[PDB]
Amino acid sequence: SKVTTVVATPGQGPDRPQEVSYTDTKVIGNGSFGVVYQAKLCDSGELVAIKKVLQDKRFKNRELQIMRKLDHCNIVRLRYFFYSSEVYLNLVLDYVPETVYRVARHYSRAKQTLPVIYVKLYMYQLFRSLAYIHSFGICHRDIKPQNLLLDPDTAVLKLCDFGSAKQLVRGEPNVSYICSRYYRAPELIFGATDYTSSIDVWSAGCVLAELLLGQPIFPGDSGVDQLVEIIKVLGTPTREQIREMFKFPQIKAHPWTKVFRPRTPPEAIALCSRLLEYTPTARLTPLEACAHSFFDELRDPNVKLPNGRDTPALFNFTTQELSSNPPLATILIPPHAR
Amino acid sequence: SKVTTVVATPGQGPDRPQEVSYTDTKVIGNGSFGVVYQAKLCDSGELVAIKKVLQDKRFKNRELQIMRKLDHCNIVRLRYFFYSSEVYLNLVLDYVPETVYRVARHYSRAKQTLPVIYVKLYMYQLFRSLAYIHSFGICHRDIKPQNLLLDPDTAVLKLCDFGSAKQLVRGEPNVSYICSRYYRAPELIFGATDYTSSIDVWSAGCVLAELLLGQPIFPGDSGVDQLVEIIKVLGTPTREQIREMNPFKFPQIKAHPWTKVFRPRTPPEAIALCSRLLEYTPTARLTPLEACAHSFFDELRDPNVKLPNGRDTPALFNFTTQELSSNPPLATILIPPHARIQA
Ligand SMILES: Nc1ncnc2c1ncn2[C@@H]1O[C@H](COP(=O)(O)OP(=O)(O)NP(=O)(O)O)[C@@H](O)[C@H]1O
Ligand SMILES: Nc1ncnc2c1ncn2[C@@H]1O[C@H](COP(=O)(O)OP(=O)(O)NP(=O)(O)O)[C@@H](O)[C@H]1O
């Protein structure tokens, strides 16, 4: 089979390029402005994903600059990057077999819901990844099931796709047309330009709700439809809430408990209500979300995956990761963990 | 079977309540905030559609107020309206069997595309409905295949769903979150608040392109994706063009030759029409009346034009003074010689 050899620069560390050979290339994904392939590294045999995007040589690639700064167990790792050819930038990433999207779809069209233990594991790891990037001022801006990679057997989740990510800086305006439909925060729908990283939290909340319901909680082909669905659940925004973020129906909130199926864990519902809040500043921070009681089972000395394996890394927090509220380490790192 | 009798107010004319009895009610449509039923009138056995929406006791219904002013052969007719019960407003409309959406989906999954003669008829009638509402300053704001009703046998198209419509007043700001995904004008994606009725033209262009392609021309789950698809076709917006849409870090891509965008043997005139509809600069897009006069529709003006099934085409030239008001002279092109024959 065709063997390709390039001189690629390690994602992290010093700019010291090395020769890398790979083979067995096959498209495994796309995107409006991208193509992803899977390939096997010739020496290690490890599988990698290679994201190829047209790059304007005259400028710096933001996705690349952001990924080079990230080192977290819940964020897909950038192994190397290299150019090829119009010039293309190629991001060689760790290969991850699944997405929360594909997995959720399996349960949905099987008429079942993902067991709660997995909802806990996946959401907890997503919030860890968010606490980490937010600590650098980086907002992902495209949190959705398709960007959440999963390894089925280890239950490890890895946030991926930083093509919409950006460091948010007070006073600077940001485009409001980022983020996928169903997962957009209300302020985004209203065209806000001074939004914060809390838009990622709203999205995380939509993912949680969706994993619990078996379908998107705020569907809709237009912004107006999405606003209506949001309003049918949260109730009409008070004027003050709208300001924080109007020809809309005056509707009373729908009992969060009646939104979900009966049997849905109370803690899960409570978490949702603290994520999907109109007022951006009232939503939990990702670190606070990790500490929520819904995740207490993950901190149980005896929890194990359904396949019998131990849970993946969950407590290896760093100072960087806890910076938004250090005292939470008392909750986040159980007595038995190290 | 159950018979429902209600007292309803006429759509237009004197407010003289009518008593209406209908049966065989069944759901035929939905909306995040609505439900449409089909019903059979007891007297004539005619079918009608009834759009039921919750009504703010505290406001007047804009969709209703707008529909009461419309009288056009390419706009679904509001027959009566009445309240029922929380209070609901019920709009009784003429029943139309199909949508451009369903028709297009059938051809698309059958690996076909509808005869261009239908593309001409549907688009022409859509542009007539737009020239008419725009002449009143009314912008639909939700032009998409599902809101284009069709009668398969007569080939008559009727614009429906004025739940997003609004009279655009210069100097006034408007929400940018209206309009379905694939059909949103770029200025809407950029969050413009001072957009005009030309956003309906962009949408009409997306419908045309989609009818020609067999699928949406600018798909995408996020605004960014849509902008990329738009850019892959139109090319990167110039500095000035960005200022026209109003309210940018996208790769510089050159325009894709429109001809290369559509299947082989797509009519040149169709492609040309698209290019004049899907323009970045809002003011550069054709007006709907100008669109009706485009050469792509010349065949509809031919005296011997017939529907494939052999019938005559629907009325196409009964233009009113209101319809032509945006540019009266165009009538020299819009009303063909044979249609001016007194006989
Ligand atoms: N490291 C990886 N391992 C395995 N599959 C991957 C990896 N990275 C991307 N993919 C897959 O390819 C798809 C598209 O990759 P992605 O990075 O998100 O491209 P994109 O163009 O930025 N996408 P988007 O803007 O979300 O439409 C993902 O949803 C995954 O299913
Ligand atoms: N006069 C009619 N005759 C037959 N079917 C109709 C009629 N009006 C509406 N429908 C159907 O019902 C669907 C929904 O009606 P619609 O008026 O658009 O509700 P809506 O809540 O405003 N929809 P939307 O905002 O587009 O999601 C339409 O797309 C048609 O398929």
Ligand SMILES: [Mg+2]
């Ligand atoms: Mg993605």
Ligand SMILES: [Mg+2]
């Ligand atoms: Mg992306």
Ligand SMILES: [Mg+2]
């Ligand atoms: Mg509709």
Ligand SMILES: [Mg+2]
């Ligand atoms: Mg509507």
